[PDB]
Design a protein around this ligand. Structure first.
Ligand SMILES: [Ca+2]
Ligand SMILES: [Ca+2]
Ligand SMILES: [Ca+2]
Ligand SMILES: [Ca+2]
Ligand SMILES: [Cl-]
Ligand SMILES: [Cl-]
Ligand SMILES: [Cl-]
Ligand SMILES: [Cl-]
Lengths: 9, 236, 236, 9
């Protein structure tokens, strides 16, 4: 999966 | 000058309405107009700017990824020779995405960053600069790929240095900066160990500072800490 | 002429890529270009045209509804007088939506409908004409509201008359036309009894014809029949 | 709720 960054969406 | 005839306050009001209507292209144009009025942005206004462009570029990035995957499959041995259309259309989306990144970087350079003296604003804008160079790096393949990567790194590094001196380890901007710099290391700089070390240290130093926070601040900080944990779980 | 230099087949190929990338504005522009080549559209190409514009206008309609609701609340007794911004922005979105509807109606009038002689194509295009006049009617408030409503009704009625003569009661285009004409009656024409009668008769006549169908056609028809049932459950 | 039309989305 792709990693989470901030902000989301 | 696109929005040059509209009042600053009306542009901010309409950006908020556009957010509610999920009209993020409009939201970004309203916030660009507000920036171009030349006044500094408040905390709320900075968040509106960030939300607007993150959603615009987010859709472009997702589309680019779909098209790049199709293009890669078309260039595998045994693939029937399609024409130039997949490459052409991937290039179209890529150019649009690059234009959005250049627009954001332009607002930061003219003149948001130079006017930003408080830690919260300066870190926010330097994080944004790192983020939009990171998005350019995701699609870069030519002579300037290394320089784009270094521009992202340099912006993130200046933001990190300020945040460590001027903000507590639980500050949400500091946490989101560290989260994204860690993603930069993993996905862009081919430095997974640096990515993991940064995420772990950031998480642990925030954990140790939660005791100082109110219930509402605790909620804000732990939300981003969970994203650090999610990445560490993906990467280890 | 926006797409005048691109091959018809390349425009169709790129419309399919745009669909996969969820780039519906691009998809609609590619399909507009394909229509403007002047050749009739195949069944697959008609569906691409419909999907593209339905998704574009669908986002506009949803945004218009959010903004109209905010505007209505701002015009309730006890509401603090905000400025003109909510109305102005609702008007902006409304004008954009009207422009998309006018574009589709223009393609149908120049010259898709007049060249469409087979039942499947002619019913499809007349349904589309009714649908886009229906979307105009959803936002109409002036002297022409009644004429817009009658234009939707007239298009749907011609499509219904052809579909009843030339298509079996389970034909998916016939079913989707009846579904949408029933929504027109309920939501636009203030005729809930007509809406319910049409949905019930359509459902029952399709039920009685399912025995003639293959497994795959049965799946296609029962999917739309379920939408008729869903509306009847909402309305009764 | 708003009623269902076709095609969806
Ligand atoms: Ca002013
Ligand atoms: Ca190791
Ligand atoms: Ca040709
Ligand atoms: Ca009755
Ligand atoms: Cl082959
Ligand atoms: Cl293209
Ligand atoms: Cl009041
Ligand atoms: Cl406006």
């Amino acid at each position: 999966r792709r990693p989470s960054s901030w902000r989301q969406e | 000058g696109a929005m040059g005839s509209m009042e600053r306050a009306s542009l901010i009001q309409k950006a908020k309405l556009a957010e509610q209507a999920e009209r993020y292209e409009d939201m970004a144009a309203f916030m660009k107009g507000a920036v171009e009025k030349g006044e500094e942005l408040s905390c709320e206004e900075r968040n509106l700017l960030s939300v607007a462009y993150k959603n615009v570029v987010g859709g472009q990035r997702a589309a680019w990824r779909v098209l790049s995957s199709i293009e890669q499959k078309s260039n595998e041995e045994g693939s029937e020779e399609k024409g130039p259309e997949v490459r052409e259309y991937r290039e179209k989306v890529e150019t649009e995405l690059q234009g959005v990144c250049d627009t954001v970087l332009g607002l930061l350079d003219s003149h948001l960053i130079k006017e930003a003296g408080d830690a919260e604003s300066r870190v926010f804008y330097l994080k944004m600069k790192g983020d939009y160079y990171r998005y350019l790096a995701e699609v870069a393949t030519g002579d300037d790929k290394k320089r784009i990567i270094d521009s992202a790194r340099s912006a993130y590094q200046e933001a990190m240095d300020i945040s460590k001196k001027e903000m507590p380890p639980t500050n949400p901007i500091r946490l989101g900066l560290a989260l994204n710099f860690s993603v930069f290391h993993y996905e862009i700089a081919n430095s997974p160990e640096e990515a993991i070390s940064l995420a772990k240290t950031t998480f642990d130093e925030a954990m140790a500072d939660l005791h100082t926070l109110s219930e509402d601040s605790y909620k804000d900080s732990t939300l981003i800490m969970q994203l650090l944990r999610d990445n560490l779980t993906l990467w280890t």
